[PDB]
């Protein structure tokens, strides 16, 4: 058999996708009834940087499907050499690093799946807990209408723009000039949602990206490794604020979305994040079910 | 209905009876209660690490069937209401080392899984758990015995050895120097507590009072900057003026030569080794007992 | 009585084969057995990290039902605030092995000297006694018998491995050499326990400074790296003695043709080892290191079934 790897949203076809997200609602209805690795067999979770969330849903995740997370967080060896070693101990290695040439080279000569737990340029696990969420909420997800406000350049921008249009979801970035998705990632995405119908649109324009949609997302405007990086990054981001205003222009029965943790007052105001449209929370427990179907699918599929 | 522990008398002397006798059966049995089958997830938070307590933990949330998440050293970037909100789907207890009261005040009023004080600056309330149980595999019945801690009146196991203490039914006595002697509205609320028990508060600087008759002798570290605690070193001397068959107790680490002498803690009033072994078994039967009741 | 395995020689011949017979077995069968299912604890402590030796420790309890209670070294050293004696009883009450990764090995003698359950050297100063079962585990696999085979190690000749080495390996029957420089070479204790040892086995113990006389015939080739943390600043020149001791094609090429190479990682290739040595047909290296869970596992499930 193939190793399947999971490194951005797109390495999953969209009848591939709607496969994991199934198995997303069965877990969270049963999330003991998928024993995989049963034994326990081990799972790598290795951290360049450490993230304590993605750390702890993946750690009880992978104990709740019978295994053993062992953990390795934040040189001495090539990569090679460690995804040599790292497949005779465990059944799939997850990782946290930075540049996505890093997780192509892992994935190339590890023989277990490779997951993508954060990266710079792409989150494709909280994509997939996103859409879990949203499917909870609205039924089906072909044909809706998703907004992402704030830099339109990062890793969840990215992954809504890949995930959401593998899912058939017509997805929207706002973002100030000079913060726009990259182009390999914009083209990559507008190619996929020509096999589900769906679109891609970027624009400036808050206002006219937040009316008539039915999903509204934002994350932090800052990642710690941009706090150095010179720009002012408050001013450009104040009109993308995700606040009651804005959320007033979009579909009445729209709901909200952000990645753990936000910065109240920022991207974000609390009475959003604490009103009725918000699925935050179930978003962020959604973490949890999707990564564990995710990791079940690709070790059945490996 | 979400029960807490985060003070000593959190549970009523009824209650600290259920607790105690829980704590009994799980040594016995230690893996005969398995509540976080699954596994489910328990947080173990620490806003400054211990090793001791950390360990404990861990270990018996495993032998209870679950996984513990441990976390070391929240409110970095996320408020305290939103990290309770989020724990409680993913957890069923938050066990938290943390300094301030008020801090984990604020998570229990939000969080709606259990939160437990694994250690503060103002109380120790699991480890008077594992002295009491202790106390009771030694001596049997707790009520109308006399417990004397000697040495800095104004730390956690000065406060949670008052409260613990006199919900269990034990006359307590605290000896300590002036400048370091308990909380007046702890000492106050043990005094309420001991009208309900028959038992009683005493706070003393005469280590010689404090230890004649007594039938329980406990201290701690005291951090010459320690110049007023040496008249309370628990040495041989003191140790004799207690009743016969008298217990010494001391949560661990201890500093040998200072508060407590080679000849007390190895000799046979010493129950300071069972009593590190119990924090395993009164911590699994506390968490046993809020997640039944929660 | 209590077993501990505080260095290769704590293990007698026939003792050692039994541990490796069940290596053999556990690297088979992985969860078929299940000492410490509750789970019951197993402290493995750290005064130094082994990242390393925390995986494949924690997994491998797993594996045995239990669960690893892992202190790192940012926690206050074992002896600062405790006496060793305090934390051997105390640990005694809580876990049913103490796995210890330690600097000298008087700390590890007073800790089996007081605990009542069995201590592991997980890694220390003078010995690195799991890792070199693992290496008669693998060695067993690729050539069968190990009785009368030729072991050389090459680099520093007083490091843990070579010192493990010599004393594991007679103990297995094997006929051990050491080639280092001058100044290098293994602590005299060591060599005289090896010796005493190997007459019980037929073993030998060769310690020369000739790297090509030491190669010539072998039929195991073992180095390890040129230097630890703790030795770089030690003052001395940790690089120019220890080339002509590398493990390249042309040392190989002088070995017995079935020669197979060994190496417990990390390795920095292109010092002690050449990528071509690493990568080619003789290297065991990373069976050798997947022999690690294996190997710990049956070290343990005996020890514990001993105690
Ligand atoms: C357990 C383990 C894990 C990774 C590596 B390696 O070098 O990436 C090595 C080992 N080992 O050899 O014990
Ligand atoms: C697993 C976890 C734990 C805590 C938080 B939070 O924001 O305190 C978030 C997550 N999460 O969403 O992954
Ligand atoms: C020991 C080690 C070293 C490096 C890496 B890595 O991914 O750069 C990983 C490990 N590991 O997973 O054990
Ligand atoms: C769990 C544990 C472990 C070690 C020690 B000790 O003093 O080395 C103490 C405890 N304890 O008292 O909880």
Same mark, same amino acid.
């Given at each position: 058999? &193939?190793?399947? *790897?999971?490194?951005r /949203?797109?390495?999953?076809? #969209?009848?591939?996708?709607?496969?994991?997200?199934?198995?997303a609602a069965?877990?969270?209805?049963?999330?003991?009834?998928?024993?995989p690795?049963?034994?326990?067999?081990?799972?790598?979770?290795?951290?360049?940087?450490?993230?304590?969330?993605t750390?702890?849903?993946?750690?009880?995740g992978i104990?709740?499907?019978?295994? *053993?997370?062992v953990?390795?967080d934040?040189?001495?060896e090539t990569?090679? /050499?460690?995804?040599?070693?790292?497949?005779?101990?465990?059944?799939?290695?997850?990782?946290?690093?930075?540049?996505?040439?890093?997780?192509?080279?892992?994935?190339? &000569?590890?023989?277990?799946?490779?997951?993508?737990?954060?990266? $710079?340029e792409f989150? #494709?696990?909280?994509?997939?807990?996103?859409?879990?969420?949203?499917?909870?909420?609205?039924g089906?997800?072909?044909?809706?209408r998703?907004?992402?406000?704030?830099?339109?350049?990062?890793?969840?921008?990215?992954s809504?723009?890949?995930?959401?249009? @593998?899912?058939?979801?017509?997805?929207?970035?706002?973002?100030?000039?000079?913060?726009?998705?990259?182009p390999?990632?914009?083209?990559?995405?507008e190619?996929r949602?020509? /096999? @589900?119908?769906?679109?891609?649109?970027?624009?400036?324009?808050?206002?006219?990206?937040?009316?008539?949609?039915?999903?509204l997302?934002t994350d932090?405007?800052t990642?710690?490794?941009?706090?150095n990086?010179?720009?002012?990054?408050?001013? #450009?981001?104040?009109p993308?604020?995700?606040?009651?205003?804005?959320?007033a222009?979009? $579909?009445?029965?729209?709901?909200?979305?952000?990645?753990?943790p936000?910065?109240?007052?920022?991207?974000?105001?609390?009475?959003?994040?604490?009103?009725?449209?918000?699925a935050?929370?179930d978003?962020?427990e959604?973490r949890? *079910?999707?990564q564990k179907?995710?990791?079940?699918?690709?070790?059945?599929?490996?």
């Amino acid at each position: 058999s &193939v190793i399947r *790897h999971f490194l951005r /949203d797109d390495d999953l076809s #969209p009848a591939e996708q709607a496969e994991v997200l199934e198995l997303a609602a069965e877990l969270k209805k049963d999330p003991v009834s998928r024993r995989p690795l049963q034994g326990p067999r081990g799972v790598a979770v290795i951290f360049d940087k450490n993230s304590t969330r993605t750390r702890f849903s993946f750690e009880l995740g992978i104990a709740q499907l019978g295994g *053993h997370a062992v953990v390795v967080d934040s040189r001495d060896e090539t990569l090679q /050499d460690t995804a040599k070693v790292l497949s005779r101990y465990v059944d799939a290695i997850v990782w946290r690093t930075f540049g996505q040439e890093r997780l192509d080279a892992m994935a190339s &000569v590890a023989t277990v799946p490779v997951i993508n737990a954060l990266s $710079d340029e792409f989150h #494709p696990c909280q994509v997939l807990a996103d859409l879990q969420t949203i499917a909870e909420r609205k039924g089906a997800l072909r044909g809706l209408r998703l907004s992402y406000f704030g830099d339109g350049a990062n890793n969840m921008a990215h992954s809504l723009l890949l995930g959401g249009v @593998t899912a058939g979801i017509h997805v929207t970035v706002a973002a100030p000039e000079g913060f726009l998705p990259d182009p390999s990632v914009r083209a990559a995405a507008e190619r996929r949602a020509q /096999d @589900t119908g769906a679109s891609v649109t970027v624009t400036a324009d808050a206002h006219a990206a937040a009316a008539g949609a039915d999903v509204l997302v934002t994350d932090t405007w800052t990642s710690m490794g941009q706090e150095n990086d010179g720009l002012d990054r408050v001013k #450009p981001f104040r009109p993308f604020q995700l606040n009651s205003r804005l959320l007033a222009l979009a $579909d009445s029965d729209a709901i909200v979305l952000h990645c753990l943790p936000a910065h109240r007052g920022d991207e974000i105001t609390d009475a959003v994040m604490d009103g009725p449209a918000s699925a935050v929370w179930d978003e962020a427990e959604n973490r949890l *079910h999707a990564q564990k179907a995710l990791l079940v699918w690709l070790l059945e599929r490996s």
